[PDB]
Design a protein around this ligand. Structure first.
Ligand SMILES: NC(=O)C1=CN([C@@H]2O[C@H](COP(=O)(O)OP(=O)(O)OC[C@H]3O[C@@H](n4cnc5c(N)ncnc54)[C@H](OP(=O)(O)O)[C@@H]3O)[C@@H](O)[C@H]2O)C=CC1
Ligand SMILES: NC(=O)C1=CN([C@@H]2O[C@H](COP(=O)(O)OP(=O)(O)OC[C@H]3O[C@@H](n4cnc5c(N)ncnc54)[C@H](OP(=O)(O)O)[C@@H]3O)[C@@H](O)[C@H]2O)C=CC1
Ligand SMILES: CNC1CCCCC1
Ligand SMILES: CNC1CCCCC1
Ligand SMILES: [Mg+2]
Ligand SMILES: [Mg+2]
Lengths: 284, 284
């Protein structure tokens, strides 16, 4: 009685398909390279030999492809067969790509929800997974029970591009954290095992992640008066990081953006302010 | 009976001096701009009118100045009066600066410990504060009871530059996290309050901070085989972050280093590997 049709059997699409199968859904699967379907067919999925077969397999279509060019190309042949269906697009893309694809899909008589998967494939089906959704509220509402098999759901509203905006912002936070981890580990690699260093680093990153909640407060209030850690002193520290990196033949490129934004803010009069003040200098 | 002599009454030196006073130490204080001493003198500190007075006030000298040029300049007049003293230098600097200053100080008959304060001034005296120390093991041992008034202590060994290496690496981790927070908040600023967004961001950064412990494992083992999140797919995601940033007139400079390192690794054959593989590409 419960059915879904999946497009994309990469790492993530495979994990989606596997989870629906585990929960005894009727699951159709489609992939450009159809041999990625075999492990799923053995577990009870039906192969969509063509994209149109996948469109006709269910009124709930879940797409998870590399990029939204692949999504458009895959659907293009079948756009006249989308009437009445719900498209859940989990492909990473920009807000604008989701808004334009939403317009196209809605013009063909279907409804569109975009989703940003904040999880790795192994996390699918666990309480640690979260998917951010936006687009059709009606379609999300009627599909929510099915989507909750994959992950916790947060619905962000009717703008089809809001899920990808929030996804890409969360990923940009991640990439900053990973940039810092790689820089830090590279600096100590010749001295300390990385596993030994992360016993220092992880608690420290936790403490600095806590310093962010109040930074968000300062940002929402426009109040950057230093609480003890001024930018002049921080620019010296950053230059010491740059210089120590060079001495060890480690690249300091990860921290040069921060130095440049901090220098701009200091030129503008923030040498005695906190780092939240940089929010006004990250434009352009 | 318990005494200390502090050099530097900036934000951090003031917090050190205040904490020792609270614990009923005899505390001498020195600062280039001596009017920063008044709040401390009112609480029972003695003013060092000259650097030599500060050197002669105690055999435990704690220095906390902007940079190690200020440290050298401050001590230079008094180098012949350091015999028998312990210098605890908490000034941020490079490993080499600490090694050279250590050599100079030891040549003048004193002992030298460098310290990296992993705390803000308000954290001094709390269990959340940590100071990383390296240099003379004997001097650290006999001063440890006094230093523990400020913060938890970790001693890293006899290399006078190890405390600053580990400090600067931890700070580089911090700056990566803060780079990601600023990028993320800048992207959503026009859509969402920052305080609302951090309710998503903080748990997410926690989950990604956990992903780092296994990354350290992969690094120490040289084994980068993907567990589900390949670099080819990540480079697409990063480009989507760059493009979404431009559309919103937000700078994407924070993530360009990561894109460049990831592109280099993919050229070298890691398109199907995990992000830990970048550790070999952050050189130069
Ligand atoms: N950790 C993860 O892996 C996460 C992934 N995501 C997102 O999920 C999506 C899928 O990622 P993931 O499964 O990891 O990526 P993969 O690299 O494992 O798989 C990419 C998928 O896209 C397909 N594809 C690529 N180009 C085309 C094309 N031109 N036409 C049709 N299909 C094509 C591939 O088909 P083929 O098999 O034929 O090559 C494959 O199904 C991405 O948007 C990613 O950002 C989100 C969160 C986490
Ligand atoms: N959150 C923080 O504030 C933290 C700071 N630190 C480190 O602690 C150190 C002190 O930082 P903080 O107190 O915040 O910085 P401040 O900017 O508040 O104070 C800087 C101090 O250095 C002195 N100084 C600067 N140039 C000279 C000079 N040429 N000769 C003599 N003294 C000079 C200033 O004297 P004057 O008052 O006369 O200007 C002042 O005492 C730095 O190395 C920093 O990295 C470590 C961790 C956290
Ligand atoms: C040296 N820079 C400081 C370190 C402690 C946190 C705030 C910034
Ligand atoms: C889209 N890139 C992925 C997101 C989830 C964590 C690993 C990297
Ligand atoms: Mg392509
Ligand atoms: Mg100076």
């Amino acid at each position: 009685m419960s059915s879904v049709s999946i497009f994309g059997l990469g790492a993530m699409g495979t994990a989606l398909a596997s989870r629906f199968l585990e929960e005894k859904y009727k699951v159709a699967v489609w992939n450009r390279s159809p041999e990625k379907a075999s492990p799923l067919l053995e577990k009870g999925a039906t192969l969509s030999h063509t994209a149109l077969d996948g469109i006709n397999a269910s009124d709930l279509i879940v797409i998870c492809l590399l990029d939204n060019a692949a999504v458009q190309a895959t659907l293009n042949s079948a756009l006249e067969h989308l009437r009445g269906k719900t498209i859940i697009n989990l492909t990473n893309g920009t807000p604008d790509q989701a808004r334009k694809l939403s317009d196209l899909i809605v013009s063909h008589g279907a409804q569109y929800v975009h989703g940003g998967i904040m999880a790795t494939p192994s996390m699918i089906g666990s309480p640690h997974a979260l998917v951010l959704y936006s687009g059709s509220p009606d379609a999300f509402k009627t599909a929510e029970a099915d989507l909750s098999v994959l992950a916790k759901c947060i619905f962000l509203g009717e703008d089809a591009g809001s899920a990808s905006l929030h996804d890409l912002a969360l990923l940009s936070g991640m990439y900053g954290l990973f940039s810092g981890f790689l820089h830090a580990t590279a600096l100590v690699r010749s001295s300390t095992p990385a596993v030994k260093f992360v016993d220092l680093l992880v608690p420290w990153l936790g403490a600095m992640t806590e310093y962010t909640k109040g930074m968000a407060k300062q940002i929402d209030e426009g109040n950057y008066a230093s609480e003890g850690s001024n930018l002049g002193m921080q620019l010296v520290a950053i230059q010491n990081i740059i210089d120590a990196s060079a001495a060890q033949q480690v690249s300091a490129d990860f921290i040069r953006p921060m130095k440049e934004f901090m220098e701009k803010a200091v030129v503008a009069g923030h040498g005695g302010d906190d780092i939240s003040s940089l929010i006004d200098f990250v434009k352009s």
